[model samples]
Target: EDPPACGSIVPRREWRALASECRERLTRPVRYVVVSHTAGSHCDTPASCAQQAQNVQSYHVRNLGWCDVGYNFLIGEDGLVYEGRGWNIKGAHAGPTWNPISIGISFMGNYMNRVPPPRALRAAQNLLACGVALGALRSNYEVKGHRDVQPTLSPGDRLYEIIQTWSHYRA
Candidate 1:
């Protein structure tokens, strides 16, 4: 059987993302992907996680006054990928230089003192693989922690260490 499409593994409509106001698109074969963490509350069920998705967008749109959620995608502890701005759009994540050329994916919770569930990690890896398959990412794309290009503890300590071990990760 053929492998599942990226949409099959990570259904965007399932998370009920808000309409994006962004119009800018990133160039194809994106070379960098920055991973981050919400540093906020986490949820483990579809019901709760969906609410968390809404709350995240609400904060970005209402509080931060952003056009939409910053990251291109969000991974939940429930092992589901939640769509933010999605592929193609230039995310307001990472730094200005990084945002234009990279896709940003944020884990749905803080990882300062804890590790994400194995399923969460698997989902992230799978998502990257799918991005490559779909031509949204370069075959040799590099992964970096949010802290790598910016001055923040984002993606958190525990998660940062974990991503460092990933094959695609770069210094």
Candidate 2:
């Protein structure tokens, strides 16, 4: 994956800079970061289409008993990483099977619905690289679609393929 841009919104070391704040976000324990695609299905490329996805994530996380965002991180169509539930806590995005041991990060568009732009894809790669380096993932972590673990076609075939396109993926 290509290196992150200089002005990337969410710093690569976001948690490093807010260690205390992140620790406070975790009510329980955390281990990994489950990655997902928002399936927002937007056609816009340059414009911001993240509002809906962000809102949905916020609601979902809060409903799951989290204080704010659910995932530890979020990648938008604008290709910027946004701080989700912070870094120290596990995320609510993985549902029951994976919530306790992992954080969940998500991309804000459905690659099935529309091809994610270069910016978004690049940002996702950079975030994942940094996350792995920080031991936020299993090194052999599963870069999966929601359907990979659940019964739904969450990320869809097209979206899943894009994620797999990365060379970092082992499978």
Candidate 3:
């Protein structure tokens, strides 16, 4: 059977990402999906979200001195998924131990006191489904909050609460 295509991932180029080079592979059918939030500004329009995506990439590449944005995928309040390191590349998120084993998907917003819009949540769900279909994530892969793995309120309280009810959430 052929793998299904991703719904509509906004490629790094589309978001005008900086030229970056990193060589680290995550073994296929990874076991976990770690969710987190940027704890930064939110954008709801394609134009705005695209700019936000660029800002995020710049932060990671410039400020953090990382090879690229830390997440495998970044979800926008505009209901889009911004490609980061992608499924094949190992991302520098969570921590040293979990980075190689999980896909980090961060929402582009602070969700501590506010809940993400419905469209953002839907886009995140779709992203996960795409991962499973593309063989990057196992069909039975477990979902974890960033806080669950490392010491941070990454995904945010409101968003974290929402993910707990997800069918794949690790108990």
Q: How do all models score by TM-score?
A: 0.94, 0.67, 0.96
Which tens-of-lDDT digit does each residue in 96-132 have in candidate 1? 7999999999999989999999999988999998899
lDDT of 1 at 44: 87
Using lDDT, rank the candidates from best to worst: 3, 1, 2
Write one digit per residue (lDDT tens) for candidate 3, span 1-171. Answer: 673976699988898988768789999989999999999999999999999999998899899899999899999889999989999999998999999899999999999989999998898899888888988899999999989998898899999999998999987
Q: Candidates sorted by TM-score, descending order? A: 3, 1, 2
**Residue pairs clashing, model 3:** none
For 121-171, candidate 2 gives per-residue lDDT tens digits of 787777766665655555555565566667766565676777667554434
Q: Pick out the ten consecutive residues of candidate 1 with the lowest summed lDDT.
A: 3-12
Best by TM-score: 3
Give the root-mean-square deviation of each candidate in angstroms. Answer: 1.7, 5.9, 1.1
Q: What C-alpha lDDT, on a 0 to 100 scale, does residue 85 get in candidate 2?
A: 62
The positional error of residue 136 in candidate 1, measured at the CA in angstroms, is: 0.7
Predicted structure 2, TM vs. truth: 0.67
